[PDB]
Amino acid sequence: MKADAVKIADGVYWVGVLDWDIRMYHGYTLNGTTYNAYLVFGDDKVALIDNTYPGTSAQMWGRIKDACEKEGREFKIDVIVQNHVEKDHSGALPEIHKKFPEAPIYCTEVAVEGLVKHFPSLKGAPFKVVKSLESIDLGGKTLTFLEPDSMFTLYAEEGILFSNDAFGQHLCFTQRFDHEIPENILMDANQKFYANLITPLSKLVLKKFKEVIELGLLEKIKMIAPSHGQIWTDPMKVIGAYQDFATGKCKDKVTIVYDTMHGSTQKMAHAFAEGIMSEGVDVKMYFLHNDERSEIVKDILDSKAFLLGAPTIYDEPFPSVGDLIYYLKGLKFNRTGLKRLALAFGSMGGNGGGTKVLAEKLKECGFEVLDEYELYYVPTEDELEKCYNMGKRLAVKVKEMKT
Amino acid sequence: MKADAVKIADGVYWVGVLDWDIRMYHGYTLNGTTYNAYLVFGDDKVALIDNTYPGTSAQMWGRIKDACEKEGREFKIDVIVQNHVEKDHSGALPEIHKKFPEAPIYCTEVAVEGLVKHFPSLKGAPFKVVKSLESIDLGGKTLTFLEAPLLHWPDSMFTLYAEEGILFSNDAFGQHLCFTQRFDHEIPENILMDANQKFYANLITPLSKLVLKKFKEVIELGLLEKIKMIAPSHGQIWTDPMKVIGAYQDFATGKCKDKVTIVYDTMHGSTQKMAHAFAEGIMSEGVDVKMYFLHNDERSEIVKDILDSKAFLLGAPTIYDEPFPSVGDLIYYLKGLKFNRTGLKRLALAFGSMGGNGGGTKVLAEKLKECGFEVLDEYELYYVPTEDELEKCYNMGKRLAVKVKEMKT
Amino acid sequence: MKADAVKIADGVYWVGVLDWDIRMYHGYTLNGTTYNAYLVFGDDKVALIDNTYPGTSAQMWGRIKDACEKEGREFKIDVIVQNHVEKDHSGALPEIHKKFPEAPIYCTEVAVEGLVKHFPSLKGAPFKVVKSLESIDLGGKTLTFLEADSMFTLYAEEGILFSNDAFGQHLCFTQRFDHEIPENILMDANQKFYANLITPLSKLVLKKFKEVIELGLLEKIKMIAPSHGQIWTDPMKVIGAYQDFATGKCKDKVTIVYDTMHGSTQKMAHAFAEGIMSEGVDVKMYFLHNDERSEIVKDILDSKAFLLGAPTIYDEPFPSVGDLIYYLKGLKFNRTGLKRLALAFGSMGGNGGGTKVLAEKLKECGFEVLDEYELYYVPTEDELEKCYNMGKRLAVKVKEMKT
Amino acid sequence: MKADAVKIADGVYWVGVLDWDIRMYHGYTLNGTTYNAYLVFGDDKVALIDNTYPGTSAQMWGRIKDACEKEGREFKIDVIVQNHVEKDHSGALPEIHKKFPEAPIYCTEVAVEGLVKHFPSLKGAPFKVVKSLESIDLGGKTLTFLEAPLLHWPDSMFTLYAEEGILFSNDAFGQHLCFTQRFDHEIPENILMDANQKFYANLITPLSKLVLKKFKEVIELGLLEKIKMIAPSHGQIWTDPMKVIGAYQDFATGKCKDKVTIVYDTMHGSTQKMAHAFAEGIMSEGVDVKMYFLHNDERSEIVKDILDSKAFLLGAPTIYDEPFPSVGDLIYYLKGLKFNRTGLKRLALAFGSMGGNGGGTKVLAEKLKECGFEVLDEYELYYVPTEDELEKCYNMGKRLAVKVKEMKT
Ligand SMILES: Cc1cc2nc3c(=O)[nH]c(=O)nc-3n(C[C@H](O)[C@H](O)[C@H](O)COP(=O)(O)O)c2cc1C
Ligand SMILES: Cc1cc2nc3c(=O)[nH]c(=O)nc-3n(C[C@H](O)[C@H](O)[C@H](O)COP(=O)(O)O)c2cc1C
Ligand SMILES: Cc1cc2nc3c(=O)[nH]c(=O)nc-3n(C[C@H](O)[C@H](O)[C@H](O)COP(=O)(O)O)c2cc1C
Ligand SMILES: Cc1cc2nc3c(=O)[nH]c(=O)nc-3n(C[C@H](O)[C@H](O)[C@H](O)COP(=O)(O)O)c2cc1C
Ligand SMILES: [Ca+2]
Ligand SMILES: [Ca+2]
Ligand SMILES: [Ca+2]
Ligand SMILES: [Ca+2]
Ligand SMILES: [Ca+2]
Ligand SMILES: [Ca+2]
Ligand SMILES: [Ca+2]
Ligand SMILES: [Ca+2]
Ligand SMILES: [Ca+2]
Ligand SMILES: [Ca+2]
Ligand SMILES: [Ca+2]
Ligand SMILES: [Ca+2]
Ligand SMILES: [Ca+2]
Ligand SMILES: [Ca+2]
Ligand SMILES: [Ca+2]
Ligand code: NA
Ligand SMILES: [Tb+3]
Ligand SMILES: [Tb+3]
Ligand SMILES: [Tb+3]
Ligand SMILES: [Tb+3]
C-alpha cells in the first residue's frame, strides 16, 4: 500500500497506522484510533520504535518505504525497539523480524518472554535485553531506554519521549500533533484515557513525577510521542493534566448513573439532578441501558460525587450495574487521593434490597456513601421532592469539599 | 382501532394486545410479545381478566367491542379482575375504571396499594379485596380467585373459570412470543418449548422450591385434574396444560441434559481460544455445548441454556486485578436467579488469560460458588495459549464431560 | 416533580425539559436533547411559549410552578403560544389546555388543523389564528408573531427571538446559554443540526436573511432562544454559520463513506484517503456497517468532495448505501449553491455494476461525479497505488475549488 | 488446537470449523455458522474438499490430524478441492498449499484466477483445471467434479463422491447454523427449515430460474436418484436430500403461504399505527402476518418471510419529500434479490403518514414495482390517523387478504 510518512523532527518520522473504522477496543469506545510507530534515521543506523496491530501493517510498510525514499536511504531497518508487548504495538514484529532478521530487538527482560509467547517465530530472534538507562548511538542521534513489559525511549538530542501508552489518546485524525485539533477534543480524549487506563496507577504517577521533577529530567522533555493519538508539542499540558487527575482535582460536578425496567428509577435520577442543579452544581446523566462504561468513568474522574441507581430484580440490583461495579473495583478511584461522595437509590415492588447492595459495593469501590433511598413502584410528588432535597444537600457538601 | 377478538371457549374471548415491535423488556430479549387479556361472558355479567401496557389499549378496546358484538351484547364490563399489579397487565386500568366506574376491581390487598401507587386516579375506585379464596357468579359461569398462588408475590392471583377448567395464570406458564396464532398447538413445538424454557430460566428459577411445594399440594389435593386449559398473560394459550406443568416440574427439580454452557469475554482473543478448546474436549465425550461471547450475547439467552445444562464454564481475562467487567452483569443476574434453588448444584470451571499478576480466575471461582455452582477447578494462563495449553483445556473439558455424564437426572 | 426555572431576562424564564437519556430522534443520533419552553410574565398576562414531548411534562410543570413562585404570581397561564405543530413542542398542549381552558392558543391557521389532528381533545379550544406581524400586549411586554404550520415569536422590548427549531442544536447540558459550553461542542452540534434539517431549505435561508438584513429586523435580535439546545446570547455567531452553510463555504476536506463484506472496499477507501492526505487535504472516514447517516451528512456539509464505495451484491451496490442515498436525495446538498465533487468505487467478484449504480445516484443527489473505479476481489499493490493517485488528483482539484 | 473429526461415511469425515461467535456475515444475521470442510480417504489418496475462513484454521488442522489418526493414516493430504473461491471456503488454501505443496488443487479455470488474486502466494501452485463431468480415483473412491452447476458463478463447482452418492454442494443447500450436531435429523426440523428458508431467500432467490432449469435437467437425466446425501459448506448435512431439494423447488416456483409480510418505519408512531391496523384487517380473514420495524429489525429476516408470503406491505413517513431513508436499504436489497424470478409477482401496498406535501408513498409504490411486486394501492394520510382512517387500513388489509386467499400458487 502507498502511504506517506510524516516528519516530526529532523530525521524522525511517524510511520504509524490510522485504524479509521474501529469503534471499540477492550470495552473502551472510540471513533477510530492510531497505532503510532516511529522511524529515527541516524547517520549509521535506522531504528523503528514500536509497530502495529496484527493484520494492519500495510500502512506502516508504505510509510517506512516513503521515509527511506525521502531520506535518500535504502529500505532497511538496523535497530528495532519494542516499548511494550501488547499486540497493538508489537503485532507486526514477526513480519519486521522476518524482513530484517539481523536487526537486534531492544526490549525489557519480561518483554522477551511475552513477545515469544505471542509470536513463537521470534524464538531465536536477536533480542537485546534492556535493564534501564541503557543507550545506543545511531550516528549523531542517541536513544536511551528506560524500563515490567514496558519502557519509554528518549531521543536525547531533541528531547522526544516515545512514551508508549502513557499520555496516549484514542483519536484518529489526519492531523498528527496536539495543536492541530480542537483543545476540547484532545483534553476530553486524554481525560477518557487517564480515567480508563491510568486511574489505578495514580499513586505511581505521583511518585514518578516528583522523582522526575526533583532529578531535573522534566526539562529534557520537549515532545511526547505516545503510541496512540496526537503527539504533544506542549508536553507540560498533558503532564499537568496527569498531575491533576492523579491528585483528585475535581469540578463541582456529580455523575449520575442508573438503569430502569419500568421508568421509576429514571424519575428518581432526574429528581436528584434537579436538586443538584438548584445549587449550581453540574450533572452528567448516564442510562446503563445504552451508555458506555468508558464514558461514565471519564466523567467520574473529575466529579466530586457519584450517584448510582437501579431497581430490584430478585433481591439484587438490576444486573447492568454489576458490569460498572466490576470495572470500578479495577479502576480504584480512591487511588487518586479523594474519596468521592456517593448516594445509592432505586425503586422496588416487594422486599427490595438492591439499594443496600449498591451502597455496600460503592463503599468497596472507595466512595464515601452518604445515604441510600429505596421507594415502592412509582414515586409520588412528595418522594420526588425528597430526591430533590437529597440532591440539594449533596450539592452543598460537594461545594464545601476542597479542590 | 378495529381489531378482532378470538374465541377460546363458549363465551370466553382473548382480547389482548400484540406488541409486535418490542425487542427487549427488563433486559429479556424477545421478538415481540403479547399482553393477554380475557373477556368471560356470563348470562348476567361480563368480566375482563387483566389488560395491557400503558399506551397500548387501542387493540384491546377494539377486541372488547368486537367480542361484545359477536355475543350480541351491549358494550359493558361488569367485573374487572387484576391478577397482578405490574403495568404490562394493569396499564389500562385507569382507562377501564374511567369508562366503567361502577365495575368492582377484584385483586389482592397488596395489589390495591400497588395499583393506587402506580395510578393515583384509582383512589376511591371500587376495589374488592380477595382473601385466600373467593368465587363470584357471572350467571352460569363461576370465577374463583386464588390469592398469591406461588406465595412470593402478594400482589398476584390466579383466576379459575371453574365450569370449563380455564386457569388464568397471569405470568405463570407465560412465554414471550408474538404470533397471529393464539394456541400452543398452532406453532412449532420447539419454538413454544424454547420460549417456555427461557421464561422459566429468567423469571421462575429462584421460585423453584415454591413451584414444587405448590405442585405437591395441588397433586395431593386433586385440583390438577380440574385444569383443562392454561391461559397466561403472555404468549400462547395451553390447550395441553400437562405439557407446561411437566416442563415446570422438570426445571424446578433440576432435570438437565448432558450439556455444558460456556460463556466468555476477551480483549485480544486468548480467552476465546481457551473457551473453544474446552468445548472440543467436552464434545469429544458426546456432550452438548452452547457457546456465548459476552461482547455481544444476551444474559437472557445464556440463563435459558444454563437451566438445562449440568455444567457452566465462565472465562475472562484479567484487567487491573479483576475479571473483564462484562462478567459482573451476568454474575449479578445469576446471584438473583439462584440456580441452586432447583435442587442441583451444576458443575463449573473458571478460566482466563493474564499478562502479569492475574487473579481474575480466582474472582470468577469465588463468584460462581456464591451463585450456587460446584466449582471443580480454575485455569489461568499467560497471554496466548501454546498448543500444549490448548490440549490441557481440551483434557479438562473431557474430564468435566465424563463427570457430567455420571451425574444422575 | 420539583424542578427549577432559569431566568433568562426580567420576567422571562426557561421552563423546558432536559431529555437526558434519548440517543436517537427520527434517525438523528444525539447524547440527549432538550425541549425548550419559555414563560413570559407581563404585568397583566403570563404567556407560555411552546411546551414539550408527550409524557415529559413533569419537569415543565415543576419549572412553571417555580417561576410563578419566584415572581410572586399565582400558578396561571393566560396566553399559550404554539410556534410549531410537531409533538416535541406541542405534546403537552392537551394538558395545558385542560388546566387553563380559557387561555387562547396563538398559532398559524395550518397549525390549528395539525394540532387537532394530533390531539382531538383540542377540538373547540380557543385558537387565535396568526397571519404575520401580529402583536399582543402582556402589560409592559409585547410578543410579535411572525408566520414563517410554523412561526417565530419575538419579545420586542428585549429583542428575544423564540425561533423554534431554527438555530436549535440537539444538546442536553445543565448550562442553558451558548457561552457556557465549549465552542467546538456548540458549533459541531449546530453544524449537525443544519446538515440534517436545514440543507434542503438553503435557498430560503439566503432569501430570508437578505430580506431581514436589507430591512432593520436583524439589529432588533439580541438573543435567539430556540426549541432545542443552547440559547444564543451571540445571535450573529449562529446567523453567520447559517450563511456559510447556505452558500456552500467548505473546507479542503473530503468525506469518504464505504461498506464492505470481505474487506476489499475498505482497503480501497483507505488507499484513496492516503492519496488525499498526501496533498494536505483533510479526510473523514465512515464505515456504513456501524456509523450513522446523521454524522456522515454533518461532515459532507463542509466537505468539497464525497467518496462513496461499496462492493457488488447481486448486480447492486451493498444495500446499506441505499439508506444514505435516500437521505441525500431528501437533503439536496446542491441547494447550498455548490456541486461537491464525487467518486464512486468498489470491489466485485463477477459482472460488477455496483459502482455504476453509485455514480448514477450520486449525480441524482447533486454531486459532480468525476470518476468511478471498480476492481476484482482483493486489490493488488498496483491497484492500491491507483486509488492513491486518484485520491491525490482529487485533492489537487479540491484545493483549486474557490470556497 | 486439539479438535475431533466427525465420521460421516466410511473413510469420509467432516473436518470443518465451528464459528461459534459470529453474529453477522455480509449483512446476514446468524447465531454463529460453520465452514464445512471434508476429508475423503481413498485406499491410496486423501482429498480435502474446501477449507475455511482466514485465521480460523486451528480447528480444521486439529480435525484433519484426528481423522488421520482414527483411520490409522499418516498426516497427509494428496488432493485439494476448491468448490468455490470465496474466502469462507478458501481462506486456509495458502496454509494447506504451504504444508502440502505437491498436492494438486482441483477447481474451475476462473477459480484459479480468483484464488491467485486473493492469495498471490498460490502463483505457481499445482492447479488442475476442471471443465465438468471430470473424475479422479482415490483408490476405491471416485470424485466427480461438476463445473458451475447453478451456472451463475463460474468460480464454483459441486464434487460428487460417486460410490456413496455424497454431493459436496458448497453453498447450495447450506444453512447458517452452528450446532455440535452435524446432521439434519439431529436438530429440530423448524430450526433447520427456517434456516434453509433464510439461506434461499437471501442467496438463491435471484437464481430461481437457473435452479428450475438445473433441476429439470437433473430429473429427466436421472442423476437425482444418485444423490444419497448433500454435504454443504455451511450448517447441517442432509441425510434426507429430497427434503432440501423439494424446498428449493417450492421456493424457485413461487409456492407461498396465505401470509403477508408488513414492514414499516416511523418517526412519531403514525405509520406504526397504520401498519398494525392493516395487520388487523388481514388477520380478520385468517391470513398470517409477520411484522417488521425497520428501526431495529434485519433485512435478512425480512426477506426470509417475503419468500413464502403472497403479499408485502411497505410503509414509511415522508421526510423532505422522500420516504424515511431506512426503506432505501431494504429496497436496494430487494432490487438485487429479484423476487419476481420465482415466477410470482407478490401483491403489495405502500402506505405512510405525512405532515405537508407528502410523496413518500408514491416513491414506495414506484420502487415496489421496480422490485417486481404487483402494487395494488397506496394510502398516505395526514399526521395521526383518526379512528375512521384506521378502519380504512383494516378494510384495505381485509380486501388484500381475500385476494391473497384467491391466489393459486
Ligand atoms: C423480572 C422482575 C423481577 C423483580 N424482582 C423483584 C424483587 O425481587 N424484589 C422487589 O422488591 N421487586 C422486584 N421487582 C419489581 C421492581 O423492583 C419494581 O417494579 C420497581 O418499581 C421497578 O423500578 P423501575 O421502574 O425503575 O424499573 C421485579 C420486577 C421484575 C420485572
Ligand atoms: C487495560 C488492560 C489492563 C490489564 N491489566 C492486567 C492486570 O492487572 N493483570 C494482568 O495479569 N494482566 C492484565 N492485562 C493483560 C491481559 O490480561 C492479557 O493481555 C491477556 O492475555 C488478555 O486475554 P484476552 O486475549 O483473552 O483478552 C491487562 C490488559 C489490558 C489491555
Ligand atoms: C452474497 C454475495 C453476493 C454477491 N453478488 C455479486 C454480484 O452480483 N456480482 C459480482 O460481480 N460479485 C458479487 N459478489 C462478490 C463480491 O462482489 C466480491 O467478493 C467483492 O470483492 C466483495 O468486496 P468486499 O471485499 O469489499 O466486500 C457477491 C458476494 C457475496 C458474498
Ligand atoms: C425532519 C422532518 C422532515 C419532514 N419533512 C416532511 C416533508 O417533506 N413532507 C411532509 O409531508 N411531511 C414531512 N414531515 C412530517 C412527517 O411526515 C409527519 O410528522 C408524519 O406524520 C410522521 O409520521 P410518523 O409518525 O409515522 O413518523 C417531516 C418531519 C420531520 C421530522
Ligand atoms: Ca535531515
Ligand atoms: Ca466510524
Ligand atoms: Ca516468566
Ligand atoms: Ca421486530
Ligand atoms: Ca347484566
Ligand atoms: Ca399453600
Ligand atoms: Ca495488583
Ligand atoms: Ca480455587
Ligand atoms: Ca445517554
Ligand atoms: Ca387541511
Ligand atoms: Ca453468540
Ligand atoms: Ca498414498
Ligand atoms: Ca446445463
Ligand atoms: Ca417539496
Ligand atoms: Ca399509484
Ligand atoms: Na392515574
Ligand atoms: Tb496500547
Ligand atoms: Tb408480565
Ligand atoms: Tb423540533
Ligand atoms: Tb459461503
> What total of structural domains would you count in chain D?
2
CA distance C58 to A268: 12
Write the DSSP string, B240-293. SHHHHHHHHHHHHTT--EEEEEEEE--SSSHHHHHHHHHHHHHHTTT-EEEEEE
Q: Does one domain contain both C226 and C343? A: no
Statement to judge: residues A237 and A274 lie in one domain: no
Interface test with B, best of D15, D61, D180, D387 (most B CBs within 10 A): D180
- Nearest CA to B63 among B96, B95, B15, B20? B15
b/e per residue C132-157 (b: at least 16 CB within 10 A): eeeebebeebebbbbbebbbbbbbee
| Per-position DSSP letters for A340-389, written without gaps between them | -EEEEEEEESSS--HHHHHHHHHHHTT-EEEEEEEEESSPPHHHHHHHHH
Least CB–CB distance from C270: residue in A20, A274, A282: A20
Same domain, D263 and D247: no
Identify the residue whose cell numbers are 505437491.
Answer: D102
Are residue D245 and residue D392 in the same domain, yes or no?
no
Q: Rounded to whole angstroms, how far apart are CA atoms B226 and B229?
A: 9
Secondary structure (3-state) at A148 = coil
Residues D194 and D282 occupy one common structural domain: no
Question: Cα(C131)–Cα(C151) distance, rounded to whole angstroms?
Answer: 10
Query: Which class for A107: exposed (0-12), middle (13-18), buried (19 or more C-beta within 10 A)?
Result: buried
List the one residue out of C99, C88, C98, C150 whose CA is nearest residue C120.
C98
- Find out whether A67 and A39 touch, Cβ atoms under 8 Å: yes
How many degrees, rounded to 5, is the angle at CA A265 between CA A370 and CA C55? 140
Strand partners, B347: B311, B374
Cα distance between residue D127 and residue D106, in whole Å: 6
Helix (H, G, I), strand (E, B) or coil at C297: helix
DSSP A177: B
Per the CB < 8 Å rule, is A4 touching C381? no
Cell numbers for B191, please give them. Answer: 419454538
Give the span between the Cα atoms of A285 and A291, in whole angstroms.
10
Cell 426470509, located at residue: D304
Phi/psi at C259 (nearest 5 deg)? -130, 160
What's the length of chain D? Answer: 409
Segment holding A164, helix H or strand E? strand A160-164
Cell of A333: 478511584
What is the side-by-side order of every strand in the sheet holding C341-348?
C282-287, C251-258, C303-309, C341-348, C368-376
Cell 381478566 maps to which residue? B49
Q: Which of B187, B221, B253 is the last residue of a domain?
A: B253
Degrees (nearest 5) of the Cα angle D137, D141, D144? 60
Q: Under DSSP, is residue A288 helix (H, G, I), strand (E, B) or coil?
A: coil
Q: How close, in Å, is residue D110 to chain C by CA atoms?
A: 10
Test mutation, A109, A110, A117, chain B, max B CBs within 10 A: A117
Å between B325 CA and nearest CA of chain A? 5
- Residue D192 forms part of a structural domain: yes
Query: 3-state DSSP call for residue B402?
Result: helix
Which of B120, B325, B384 lies closest to A293 in CB terms? B325
Give me the residues paired with residue D263 across strands. Answer: D292, D314
Instruction: Return the exposure string of A193-226: e unless at least 16 CB atoms fall within 10 Å of the residue's CB, then b.
Output: bbbbbbbbbbeebbeebeeeeeeeeeeebebbbb
**B131 in the same domain as B48:** yes
- Would you say the CB of residue A377 lies under 6 angstroms from ligand 1? yes
Check if the beta carbon of residue A91 is closer than 8 Å to that of residue A52. yes
Quote the CA–CA distance of B82 and B90 in Å, as a whole number.
7
- Is position A403 within any domain? no
Residues D152 and D174 reside in one and the same domain: yes
Domain closes at, from D229, D253, D277: D253
- DSSP character for A392? H
Residue at which a domain ends, from A213, A231, A247: A247
Question: Ligand 2 centroid vs A118 CA: distance in angstroms?
Answer: 13
Comparing CA positions, the residue from B310, B361, B371, B368 lying closest to residue B339 is B371
Tell me which chains share at least 3 CB pairs under 8 Å with chain D: B, C
Q: What is the DSSP letter of C129?
A: E
Q: Which pairing describes strands A46-49 and C127-130: parallel, antiparallel, or unpaired?
A: unpaired
Grouping H, G, I as helix, E, B as strand and the rest as coil, residue B100 is coil
Q: Is residue D408 part of a domain?
A: no
The answer to whether the CB of C279 falls within 8 A of the CB of C396 is yes
Residue B391's CATH number: 3.40.50.360
Indicate whether D239 belongs to any domain.
Answer: yes
Q: Give the CA distances from residue D376 to residues C25, C344, D257, D339, D373, in Å, rounded to whole numbers and listed in that order.
A: 32, 36, 19, 17, 9
Based on the fold, state whether residues A110 and A151 are members of the same structural domain: yes
What do you get for the CA distance between the two ends of chain D, in Å?
51
Q: Looking at the domain assignment, is residue D11 inside a domain?
A: yes
**What domain range includes position B167?**
1-253
Neighbours of ion ligand 23 (CB under 5 A): C 88, 165
Q: Letter for the amino acid at B90?
A: S
Whether the CB-CB separation of D394 and B62 falls below 8 Å is answered with no
Same domain, D378 and D292: yes
Distance (Å) from the alpha carbon of A29 to chain B's nearest alpha carbon: 13
d(CA C79, CA C136): 10
Exposed, middle or buried, D286 (CB in 10 Å: 0-12/13-18/19+)?
A: exposed
Does the residue A402 lie in any domain? no
> Are A164 and A158 a contacting pair, CB within 8 Å?
no
- Using CA atoms, how far apart are residues A152 and C338, in angstroms rounded to an integer? 49
Alpha carbon distance B299, A319 (integer Å): 9
* Nearest Cα residue to B408 out of B341, B311, B289, B310: B310
**B27 lies in a domain?**
yes
Taking residue D217's Cβ as centre, other Cβ atoms within 10 Å add up to 11
Q: Specify the CATH number for the domain of residue C69.
A: 3.60.15.10
Please report the atom of ligand 2 found closest to the CA of residue A26: 31
Cell 446567523 -> residue: C239
Say if residues A231 and A272 touch (Cβ distance below 8 Å): no
Q: Which of A257, A262, A264, A328 to mutate to test the interface with B (most CBs of B within 10 A)?
A: A262
Do residues D145 and D276 share a domain?
Answer: no
CA distance C256 to chain D (A): 19
The 3-class secondary structure across chain D, one letter per residue, is CCCCCEEEECCEEECCEEECCCCEECCEECCCEEECCEEEECCCCEEEECCCCCCCHHHHHHHHHHHHHHHCCCCCCCEEECCCCCHHHHCCHHHHHHHCCCCCEEEEHHHHHHHHHHCHHHCCCCEEEECCCEEEECCCCEEEEEECCCCCCCCCEEEEECCCCEEEEECCCCCCCCCCCCEHHHCCHHHHHHHHHHHHHHHHHHHHHHHHHHHHHHHHHCCHHHCCEEEECCCCEECCHHHHHHHHHHHHCCCCEEEEEEEECCCCCHHHHHHHHHHHHHHCCCCEEEEEECCCCCHHHHHHHHHCEEEEEEECCEECCEECCHHHHHHHHHHHHCHHHHCCCCEEEEEEEECCCCCHHHHHHHHHHHCCCEEEEEEEEECCCCHHHHHHHHHHHHHHHHHHHHCCC
C-alpha cell at B41: 361472558
Q: From residue C52, how far is each of C88, D124, D135, D221, D336 by CA, in Å?
A: 5, 70, 74, 72, 43
| CB count in 10 Å sphere of residue D377 | 14
Same domain, B272 and B178: no
Enumerate long-range contacts of D130-137, CB under 8 Å, 24 or more apart.
D130/D106, D130/D157, D132/D157, D135/D162, D136/D47, D136/D79, D136/D106, D137/D42
> Which chains reach chain B with 3 or more Cβ–Cβ distances below 8 angstroms?
A, D
Q: Which three cell numbers stand for residue B128?
A: 374488592
DSSP per position, B10-41: TTEEE--EEETT--EETTEE-S-EEE--EEEE
| Cell numbers given for A92 | 507486526
Are both D161 and D46 inside the same structural domain? yes
DSSP assignment of C5-58 equals -EEEETTEEE--EEETT--EETTEE-S-EEE--EEEE-SS-EEEE----TT-HH
Chain D residues in contact with chain C using a Cβ-Cβ cutoff of 8 Å: 25-27, 85-87, 114, 117-118, 120, 152-155, 206, 267-268, 299, 319-333, 335-338, 355-356, 382-384, 386
Whether residue B231 lies inside any domain: the answer is yes
Closest to B12 (Cα-Cα) out of B43, B37, B34, B41: B41
* Euclidean distance between CA atoms A113 and A106, whole angstroms: 13
Nearest-angstrom CA–CA distance, B40 and B17: 17
